[PDB]
Amino acid sequence: KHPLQNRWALWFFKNDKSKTWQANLRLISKFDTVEDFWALYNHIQLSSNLMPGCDYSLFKDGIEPMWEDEKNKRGGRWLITLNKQQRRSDLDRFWLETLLCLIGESFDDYSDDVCGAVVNVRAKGDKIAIWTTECENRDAVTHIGRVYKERLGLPPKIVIGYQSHADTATKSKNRFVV
Numbered sequence: 733k734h735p736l737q738n739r740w741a742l743w744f745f746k747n748d749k750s751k752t753w754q755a756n757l758r759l760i761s762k763f764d765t766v767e768d769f770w771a772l773y774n775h776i777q778l779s780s781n782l783m784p785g786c787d788y789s790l791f792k793d794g795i796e797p798m799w800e801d802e803k804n805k806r807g808g809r810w811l812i813t814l815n816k817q818q819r820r821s822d823l824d825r826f827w828l829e830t831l832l833c834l835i836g837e838s839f840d841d842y843s844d845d846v847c848g849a850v851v852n853v854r855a856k857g858d859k860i861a862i863w864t865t866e867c868e869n870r871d872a873v874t875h876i877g878r879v880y881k882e883r884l885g886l887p888p889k890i891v892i893g894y895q896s897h898a899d900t901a902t903k904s905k906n907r908f909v910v
């Protein structure tokens with residue numbers, strides 16, 4: 733068995749407006765092994781098969797994929813917005829590449845600023861994002877942004893923005909662009 737450098741947790745969010753947002757978050761499984769990642773990945777629905785309004789989140793064990801976690805509170809997210817009709821060709825590839833980024837510790841010296849990532853499957857258009865711990869840590873955020881952006885192979889001339897969770901919770905947006 734080939735250990736991962738971090739133990740990871742896959743969370744599911746159910747669009748169920750009859751329950752508060754927090755109660756719609758459910759833990760699916762945790763893994764700290766390459767084999768257990770693949771065993772999880774290979775036997776769970778693709779983000780694209782999720783119902784509109786549902787999210788899959790992959791966060792470091794002990795960090796709940798919500799703004800309220802101490803590790804997310806002062807954080808922010810690198811938000812990748814997907815075009816709705818590109819769902820089929822981009823969504824699952826981007827999500828997997830993202831999990832691999834997290835899991836593979838592709839952010840190196842800035843690995844500890846990464847909290848996890850969330851894939852929001854939405855009718856208006858999907859979003860994938862990586863949650864970092866301090867939206868004030870420009871270097872960390874920028875590095876994670878540049879590495880991440882390159883990894884997914886997003887058109888280089890298009891910019892992706894990083895929003896702080898604080899602004900996301902009080903919007904009527906970008907802290908950094910990359």
Ligand SMILES: C[n+]1cn([C@@H]2O[C@H](COP(=O)(O)OP(=O)(O)O)[C@@H](O)[C@H]2O)c2nc(N)[nH]c(=O)c21
Nearest residue numbers: 753754785787797798799800852854856900901
């Ligand atoms: C990530 N997140 C989302 N929400 C709530 O869910 C709403 C929907 O936000 P969304 O599901 O992230 O994307 P969407 O607007 O395209 O559907 C937010 O505006 C908040 O009301 C959240 N609410 C809480 N309390 N904590 C969170 O971490 C959190």
